[PDB]
Design an enzyme around this catalytic site. Structure first.
Site, PDB file in Angstrom:
ATOM      1  N   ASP D  38      26.830  -4.383  17.234  1.00 52.76           N
ATOM      2  CA  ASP D  38      27.359  -3.005  17.103  1.00 52.76           C
ATOM      3  C   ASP D  38      26.907  -2.290  15.797  1.00 52.76           C
ATOM      4  OD1 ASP D  38      29.229  -4.966  15.785  1.00 52.76           O
ATOM      5  OD2 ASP D  38      30.438  -3.178  15.347  1.00 52.76           O
ATOM      6  N   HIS D 243      -0.840  -6.471   6.650  1.00 47.68           N
ATOM      7  CA  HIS D 243       0.571  -6.030   6.728  1.00 47.68           C
ATOM      8  C   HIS D 243       1.516  -7.238   6.509  1.00 47.68           C
ATOM      9  CE1 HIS D 243      -1.632  -2.748   8.774  1.00 47.68           C
ATOM     10  NE2 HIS D 243      -0.644  -1.945   8.417  1.00 47.68           N
ATOM     11  N   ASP D 260       1.557  -3.021  -1.302  1.00 46.71           N
ATOM     12  CA  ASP D 260       1.400  -1.827  -0.472  1.00 46.71           C
ATOM     13  C   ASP D 260       2.809  -1.323  -0.204  1.00 46.71           C
ATOM     14  OD1 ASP D 260       0.472   0.153   1.360  1.00 46.71           O
ATOM     15  OD2 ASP D 260      -0.776  -1.269   2.402  1.00 46.71           O
ATOM     16  N   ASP D 271       2.121   6.556   0.077  1.00 44.91           N
ATOM     17  CA  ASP D 271       1.465   5.337   0.538  1.00 44.91           C
ATOM     18  C   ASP D 271       0.456   4.912  -0.521  1.00 44.91           C
ATOM     19  OD1 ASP D 271       0.337   3.191   1.998  1.00 44.91           O
ATOM     20  OD2 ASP D 271      -0.519   4.414   3.579  1.00 44.91           O
ATOM     21  N   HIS D 350     -10.749  -2.803   8.156  1.00 44.12           N
ATOM     22  CA  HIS D 350      -9.963  -1.637   8.543  1.00 44.12           C
ATOM     23  C   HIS D 350     -10.625  -0.327   8.084  1.00 44.12           C
ATOM     24  CE1 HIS D 350      -8.275  -1.238   4.449  1.00 44.12           C
ATOM     25  NE2 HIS D 350      -8.230  -2.558   4.451  1.00 44.12           N
ATOM     26  N   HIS D 354      -6.482   7.218   6.545  1.00 42.22           N
ATOM     27  CA  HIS D 354      -5.694   7.798   7.627  1.00 42.22           C
ATOM     28  C   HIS D 354      -4.956   9.028   7.118  1.00 42.22           C
ATOM     29  CE1 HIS D 354      -2.029   6.057   5.905  1.00 42.22           C
ATOM     30  NE2 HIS D 354      -2.686   4.916   5.791  1.00 42.22           N
ATOM     31  N   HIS D 361       1.125   6.815   9.035  1.00 40.47           N
ATOM     32  CA  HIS D 361      -0.090   6.988   9.837  1.00 40.47           C
ATOM     33  C   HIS D 361       0.087   8.280  10.609  1.00 40.47           C
ATOM     34  CE1 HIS D 361      -0.686   2.356   9.688  1.00 40.47           C
ATOM     35  NE2 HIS D 361      -1.144   2.959   8.606  1.00 40.47           N
ATOM     36  N   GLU D 383      -8.196   3.973   1.026  1.00 36.51           N
ATOM     37  CA  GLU D 383      -7.710   2.611   0.840  1.00 36.51           C
ATOM     38  C   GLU D 383      -8.749   1.539   1.101  1.00 36.51           C
ATOM     39  OE1 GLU D 383      -4.482   1.392   3.702  1.00 36.51           O
ATOM     40  OE2 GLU D 383      -4.757   3.351   4.557  1.00 36.51           O
ATOM     41  N   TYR D 387     -11.302  -8.631   1.424  1.00 35.43           N
ATOM     42  CA  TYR D 387     -10.448  -9.791   1.699  1.00 35.43           C
ATOM     43  C   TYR D 387     -11.376 -10.962   2.017  1.00 35.43           C
ATOM     44  CZ  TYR D 387      -7.862  -5.516   2.474  1.00 35.43           C
ATOM     45  OH  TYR D 387      -7.402  -4.210   2.372  1.00 35.43           O
ATOM     46  N   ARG D 404      -6.826  -4.577  -2.334  1.00 35.05           N
ATOM     47  CA  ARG D 404      -6.856  -3.232  -1.808  1.00 35.05           C
ATOM     48  C   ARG D 404      -6.325  -2.306  -2.881  1.00 35.05           C
ATOM     49  NH1 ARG D 404      -4.525  -4.234   2.506  1.00 35.05           N
ATOM     50  NH2 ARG D 404      -2.350  -3.642   2.286  1.00 35.05           N
ATOM     51  N   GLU D 406      -5.292   1.909  -3.184  1.00 37.11           N
ATOM     52  CA  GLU D 406      -5.080   3.061  -2.321  1.00 37.11           C
ATOM     53  C   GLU D 406      -4.382   4.217  -3.023  1.00 37.11           C
ATOM     54  OE1 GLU D 406      -2.110   2.233   0.734  1.00 37.11           O
ATOM     55  OE2 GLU D 406      -2.969   3.827   1.973  1.00 37.11           O
TER      56      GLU D 406
HETATM   57 CA   LIG Z   1      -2.302   3.155   4.047  1.00 37.81          CA
END
Ligand SMILES: [Ca+2]
Ligand SMILES: [Ca+2]
Ligand SMILES: [Ca+2]
Ligand SMILES: [Ca+2]
Ligand SMILES: [Cl-]
Ligand SMILES: [Cl-]
Ligand SMILES: [Cl-]
Ligand SMILES: [Cl-]
Lengths: 439, 437, 440, 439
Positions: D38, D243, D260, D271, D350, D354, D361, D383, D387, D404, D406
């Protein structure tokens, strides 16, 4: 013959006897179904709902409540009396008349089912419901159960157990009562008269659907308005298609016509197949295939009794078919080796027998490979067939021949009773019926 | 009479002519429907799908693609050839034969529709779809559109516009072509022969369903296998129930029987009603109600022409009914005041006319209160009735009398053609038909 | 503290012990849920699935099969190893490692569940399934059962009986094991430290959400990443709203602030409420309402033990509230008549106590009006409150005062242990705490 | 910074301006979603509904009606005032206050939507609806349209045309107004301060989730209660997972940590990604990979402007990455041939950029391979990353390095504005930041 009100009550009590104390069984009517736009097909009641009620309306639900091992009662939800809706669409039983009429204790309006059903299920341990049969029924049952679950604050509790009543109820339907046997006997007789008539009316130049027309008129004439399934009239190569229903071709001099048709009489199915020459005479080649199918049927009728099975009898039919086909040169080799390779299967590709009752392919457990031991009260068809495709790699005179012959029987203590023997199947009797009808 | 393959092609082209460039119209077959357990009712094709194809199989979808103002083409999805499934359940057209047989450019397997439909819709601006008619069709369409919306990484785009083709298609169906008129003429004739035969066979002691049996056999005899709707045979008080289909009672000496029945012939409905005495002789009271209904029908048949409407003609029928009912003492008062308070409504509670075609209650816009101006090509019924309930507060002799008389007409340049006049409705002609039988 | 592998295995066995021979119990993982567009909320495993596995992945199903009274085994469906998907979205346990890691006998790919689940149910008499919890689970179970019903030609049979395992499993969750009580203890402690810190940091001019920030950082600091429910910080009139989560106003000098917040630690919920003056000093009026709520709480803490119930203890709280409100002129009349007229209800309109566990409003049967007799192992909150609306017809100085004070307890053999007493609630101890923190 | 009432009103008018005469656009609120039993997750309004209202309640629908080319009006469905429900669950706007507060003409109760929506759509030619977003919304719209289709007797007519407003509305969202840029600027700055703080607090022995804790507290401190997506803190090998949200490991001396994270401020997403040494001092190998990623980002930041595209800039980044990897011996061969066989892809798998907005996104058409020409008002991330898997076939010292970096930018007339530059990214500035937090 008919099913009495006392019989419907007996069935309900027999189900209640098998239910746990603190339970309710829910049986829902079939939905009305669209044929096109705002027109509907003629209503057909769910077979199980019908089995327990004899009630032919939609928007109804039977609730059997077993409070404990002595106290039980029934509640019917059904459409309310509505003067306007009935002037327009037909009489409704309504709530006041339903108790006395259907032998139930209480009746309530169907429009109130969501406000009332959860109250009936509240505090019970078990709900019996056939899940997945109708989406509308599942919605109703699941909403009821959900109100109960989420309602601990209003002192509501849901049954934690749901049991499918289908196994038990279908097992009940598998064993016909004497009233049901008499109704099925009448269905068989009506159906046999229709097939007799088709044979008597058939001439070259008529279309397959003309025989359908003759059959359905004969059904209707005896008070069986509707067929139990779509009528099949397959002449020539169309006989090699098992459920051929297009029925659109001109029947030719020199072809066979295969008619598979059955009436629905008080809910119960007749199911007969007869194959016969369109011109009233079998060609050598047609006779030769016919005799093998006939021998298979005639043997099955002698054999079927308590203690054997459909599987066991099927084994004898296969032997007859394989032997016959080897004589004619359709199969080549040793009979026993051919049986072991199931070499008959290109020519006989369906089962010999299915249960028969409120559905033509009736409910009930067959056992693995239909090995279930037969007992008195079981009703089944016997429907051997041979189908030689127009392009089969066999001698040429046999191509395009499709023959099936089917009777309905009930297993008795000492054997079986043939419900559909009043329509001829011996080839010489078929020719005498037809040749006589031409004059 | 029949619908030529060239007419089916003309209907497809007339829809395409109305479509926007860069668009596709989707027309789905009807689903098969359960009668009980594994048995199905006899298949009835969706009327709109049928209108454009003449194809009587389920699991089929017609896709008309208008690339631009000159280039267009058709793709049919339909069931694949399958030796086993056909041995069992009937012949299937399949993919190879479909182009030539149905006059479509390409045919693909229905089982491939989810892998192919999105590819056909990709890059188009408009999809024409009848949303909400079949749940299975909506799932297919929405799934195709969703793959397009979510496939930009694969250079897919969805049409942003969906248009219901039903308003346009139904407006086309409202106006019958000469081929259609000839088919409906044959349906009317077949139906009339069936009603004639019911009158000829009727005797006291027969059951209502026996007349149904006679009617359906006559339909089938002329190549109309199935009724266009469920046959009604209401004797006595059952005549007062409009869609009485139980047809379960013994027809009594002294009662009327009302038969509402129509064949379906090449997809098109006939729709006739006749009411007649079970014993072949109208009682005086039955005759008196019958004449009012017949006059309503006859006046309507005189009046129906281009430039009037169902509403306008209904107004005249109401006047005839109210006058007649006052004369018999069933209504009491001044005629005009009774018309103004719709005092006829307890006795005549339905419309006078509906459109007729691939559906018995055929598609097409009626206008408010059926006020739409009539033009040549429209096909409609004319079905006045009077129904005096068994408990109505009226002179005793009229109680339990239910009478309807119905013909099918097509509007022409100068009037209408009556498609079902070959079955008698004049009371003396009915009595003479029944004695002679 | 944590839940050991042996404990998870014990729970599965206890469920199997209650199952009928020839049966299977199906327990499904929670679906991932969209927050916006392609982004998802942080995954929260279904509490029941978690109870039996400690496994925090979606697209997984636990199947416990009881063949008969001695033979039983477990099959887990879970996501396959996929190098690409894991580089992108995170490590997956997979099929090879699952048996040893989770203590199950077999593991199969979740993408194969429709091809496999029916085979596991085939020939069984009973299937245990929580119907109506997740639509995706119902679709899977119903399809399996449908294939079995219609597969008699392939010698398949469906179980005719479906039983909801929730009543039994929720009854198990109602009684905490020693390992669970140690985890809930730690949850209570972490939650108490967060409330202590909020009191220490609160100043006029700060916003309600600032205290939320302090609280969540404190949870996170001890390894409880997420709250067990949405944090409530209601200052002034916002305290009169029970589940006030907007937390958007400037906290004023002179107002109380009510903080209802709880951590989620290894799946288990803490749930504390404290109310305190934003300026570190209770006014007379605030103190007069506060004392009534505090006495209700402290007394309920003494009362709660085996053999009483939430309803019985609630009765005592009502008496204390009504007597207190009469003394202040908020209610007028005879105490016993006012109790009979439930005249306290405009001011105290919720329950005193709810079960606590893997869900903050934990599962378990309460009995009618929460009358179920308490036993050792039950865990519950004690959360009296008084809420005087800004427009209520009372002495002016009490308007807009909303106070709730809440502890978590576990019932023991001889009473109860308070799991959240390490955050102060006596008004003098609160004032003293706020004074010591401001000296930094 | 916030979105003004005039701007919400302007967005509505801009949509109405594109609508056909005789039409209505329907925009539905997001459903509340269960977290467990609930309890619900904190409410997140549908981005499109938010865009046009600034209204953060569920059970709400905005209806914009364009009668013709000059007359138009708005109807809001929203929850009724309910004293009991609001004491329990929070204040509701209600119907009386909604017109003035949200700038709509009429407000009705959401519980009346089925009784009222069909009346609003009646007689219109077009309905604009985003089909397939929410099942609850489709049921409401389809039910309205169905009542209208079948109501010719009550003189009802359904619009025959449905148009998805998403393409047009998402194209509007792609181009940020000055008010939106100011809000995104604030989101970028809040997010930068959070990353700065993570760098300052990081020590060996802390867990990944501790940095998450620091980040979220900083978001919350500036009035951004919730992250715009799930925070990623991947130290060591966890940095090679794009991610990675488990954030469960102890950060080791010698590893990098990749963070990130982005705040959500008045609906808009920041971001940022920053990678840095847990111990405050890049090794030679970490620095060598870092410099390639940094060069990619700095070059992208200098190149992004009107008239280029994400695809074109991505090409330059690929060249930099491939050259850099060849110099370190991670790739072997000729640079141009390696670019032609996309040999960078095992290490950079990647996209570079974006769109950014009410969704991290963000919506908007990218064109094939992100080739759409950039114009002022577009907001996007930059970004680049490298890797190197723990098991990759490359010089030993580079294995398990995931980096990374960004930033978020808005395209302007003469280039772009970097919204997240206030958090350092030069390796010597990172080291100095960390050394200063330790002293
Ligand atoms: Ca991003
Ligand atoms: Ca049969
Ligand atoms: Ca009619
Ligand atoms: Ca609580
Ligand atoms: Cl009802
Ligand atoms: Cl197919
Ligand atoms: Cl998987
Ligand atoms: Cl509402």
């Amino acid at each position: 013959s008919e099913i009495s009100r006392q019989e419907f009550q007996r069935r309900r009590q027999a189900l209640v006897e098998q239910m746990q104390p603190g339970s309710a069984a829910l049986i829902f009517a079939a939905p009305e179904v669209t044929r096109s736009a705002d027109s509907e097909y003629p209503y057909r009641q769910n077979s199980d709902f019908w089995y327990f009620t004899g009630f032919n309306e939609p928007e109804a639900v039977l609730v059997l409540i077993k409070s404990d091992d002595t106290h039980n009662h029934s509640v019917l939800f059904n459409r309310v009396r509505d003067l306007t809706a009935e002037i327009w669409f037909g009489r409704r039983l309504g709530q006041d008349a339903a108790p006395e009429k259907l032998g139930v204790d209480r009746a309530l309006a169907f429009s109130e089912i969501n406000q009332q059903l959860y109250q009936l299920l509240n505090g019970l341990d078990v709900v019996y419901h056939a899940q997945g049969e109708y989406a509308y029924a599942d919605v109703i049952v699941n909403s009821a159960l959900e109100k109960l679950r989420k309602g601990s604050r209003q002192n509501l509790t849901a049954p934690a157990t749901m049991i499918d009543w289908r196994p038990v109820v279908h097992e009940m339907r598998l064993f016909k009562s004497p009233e049901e046997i008499a109704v099925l006997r009448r269905a068989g007789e009506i159906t046999a008269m229709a097939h007799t008539r088709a044979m008597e009316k058939c001439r070259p130049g008529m279309f397959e659907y003309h025989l359908e027309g003759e059959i359905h008129h004969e059904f209707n004439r005896h008070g069986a308005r509707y067929p139990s399934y779509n009528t099949i009239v397959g002449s020539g190569e169309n006989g090699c298609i098992l459920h051929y229903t297009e029925n659109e071709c001109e029947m030719r001099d020199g072809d066979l016509v295969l008619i598979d048709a059955g009436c629905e009489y008080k809910g119960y199915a007749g199911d007969i197949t007869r194959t016969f020459p369109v011109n009233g005479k079998f060609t050598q080649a047609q006779r030769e295939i016919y005799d093998i199918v006939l021998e298979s049927l005639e043997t099955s009728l002698r054999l079927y009794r308590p203690g054997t099975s459909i599987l066991e009898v099927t084994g004898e039919v296969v032997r007859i078919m394989v032997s016959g086909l080897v004589k004619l040169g359709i199969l080549k080799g040793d009979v026993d080796e051919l049986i072991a390779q199931n070499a008959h299967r290109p020519f006989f590709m369906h089962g010999l027998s299915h249960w028969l009752g409120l559905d033509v392919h009736d409910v009930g457990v067959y056992g693995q490979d239909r090995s279930r031991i037969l007992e008195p009260g079981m009703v089944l068809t016997v429907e051997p067939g041979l189908y030689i495709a127009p392009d089969a790699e066999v001698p040429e005179q046999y191509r395009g021949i499709g023959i099936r012959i089917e009777d309905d029987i009930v297993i008795t203590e000492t054997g079986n009773e043939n419900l559909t023997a009043s329509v001829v199947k011996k080839p010489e009797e078929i020719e005498a019926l037809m040749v006589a009808a031409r004059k």
